[PDB]
Paper text:
CTX-M β-lactamases are prevalent antibiotic resistance enzymes and are notable for their ability to rapidly hydrolyze the extended-spectrum cephalosporin, cefotaxime. The enzyme used in this study, CTX-M-14, is a member of the CTX-M-9 subgroup. CTX-M enzymes, like other class A enzymes, utilize a catalytic serine residue (Ser70) to attack the carbonyl carbon of the β-lactam ring, leading to the formation of a covalent, acyl-enzyme intermediate. In a subsequent deacylation step, residue Glu166 serves as a general base, activating a water molecule that attacks the carbonyl carbon of the ester bond of the acyl enzyme, releasing the hydrolyzed substrate and regenerating the enzyme.
The VNYN (103–106) loop contains residues Asn104, Tyr105, and Asn106 and is adjacent to the substrate binding pocket. In cefotaxime hydrolysis, Asn104 has been shown to form a hydrogen bond with the substrate and facilitate cefotaxime hydrolysis, and Tyr105 interacts with cefotaxime through hydrophobic interactions. A handful of residues—Tyr105, Asn106, Gly238, Asp240, and Arg276—can tolerate some substitutions and retain high levels of ampicillin and cefotaxime hydrolysis. Amino acid substitutions that are predicted to have high catalytic activity based on the sequencing results were introduced at positions Tyr105, Asn106, and Asp240, and the modified enzymes were purified. Tyr105, which makes hydrophobic interactions with β-lactam substrates once bound, can be substituted for other aromatic side chains—tryptophan or phenylalanine—with no predicted impact on enzyme activity and resistance. The antibiotic resistance levels of E. coli containing the Y105W mutant were tested, and the mutant exhibited no significant change (defined as a fourfold or larger change in MIC) against ampicillin or cefotaxime. Moreover, the turnover rate (kcat) and catalytic efficiency (kcat/KM) for both substrates were similar to those of the wildtype. We have also identified a residue that can be freely substituted (Asp240) and residues that can adopt a conservative range of mutations (Tyr105, Asn106, Gly238, and Arg276) while retaining penicillin and cefotaxime activity.
Residue numbers in the entry: 26 to 57, 59 to 238, 240 to 252, 254 to 289
Amino acid sequence: TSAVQQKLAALEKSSGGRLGVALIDTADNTQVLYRGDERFPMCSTSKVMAAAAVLKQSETQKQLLNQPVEIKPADLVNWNPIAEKHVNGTMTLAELSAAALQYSDNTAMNKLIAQLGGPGGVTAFARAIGDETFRLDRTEPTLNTAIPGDPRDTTTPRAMAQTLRQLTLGHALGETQRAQLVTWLKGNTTGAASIRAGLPTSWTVGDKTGSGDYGTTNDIAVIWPQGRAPLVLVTYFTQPQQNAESRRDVLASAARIIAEG
C-alpha cells in the first residue's frame, strides 16, 4: 500500500479492467508489484521468450540466425505484416525474430515456435532460465483468446519482469545474443503509446507490446534512464468484455505512476 499502490489501484478502478504491474530497479534490486502474482494473458509479449530461445540455440549453432526459412502461403495467419512480403521466398531466423519482435508478426512467431519444437519448447526455455510461471500452450493466433480464467498462454507480472531482466540485463543469453535482443527491442515499432508514452523523454526503452481479446493490452520493457541504472517494467491489462477495445493509455499511465515513485 505504498503511495504507488493506491495510485495504481485508482488507475485500475478508473479503467474498468484488471491491471497488473511489476517493476525491478537494478540500482538496488527493489520491486513494486500490483497484482504481481495474478495470471494475465501474455499475447504477443510471449514473443520475447520465443525469440530469446532461438538466440539461445544460436549460441551453439553459430550461423543459425542466418538460416533461410521458406514462407509458404499456408504459413500466413491473421497478422503477417512482414512475412506477407516474402511468401514463396525466404526470411532468415534473424529476420523472423525481428519481424516478430518489432512488428508483432504472427507468422514469424509461428516460425520461431516451430524452430523450438512447438509451444512446449518455448516453455522449456522459460524453465531452463528459472521461470516456473510462464506457459505457452498455443501458436498464433489462438494464443490471444485471453479468456478470463483460462491459464493457457499466461504468466504473472512478477515472473515476466524477472525473466526480461535476465534476458536483457543478466546472463541468461550469451553476450552477442543479449545485445541482439536489446537491439531488437529498442527497434520495436509498436510501443509508442504504451509504457514509452508515460516515461521521461530522455529514457531509452526496449519493449514488446501485446494485444488480444478481452481488450488485453500489455507491454514489457527494459528502461535505461540517463545517469541511472536500468529498470524493468511489466504492465498487463485485460478487460471484462471479450470485445473491449485496446487501452494502451492505461499502460502509459501505469508507467508514469511508477516513474513518479
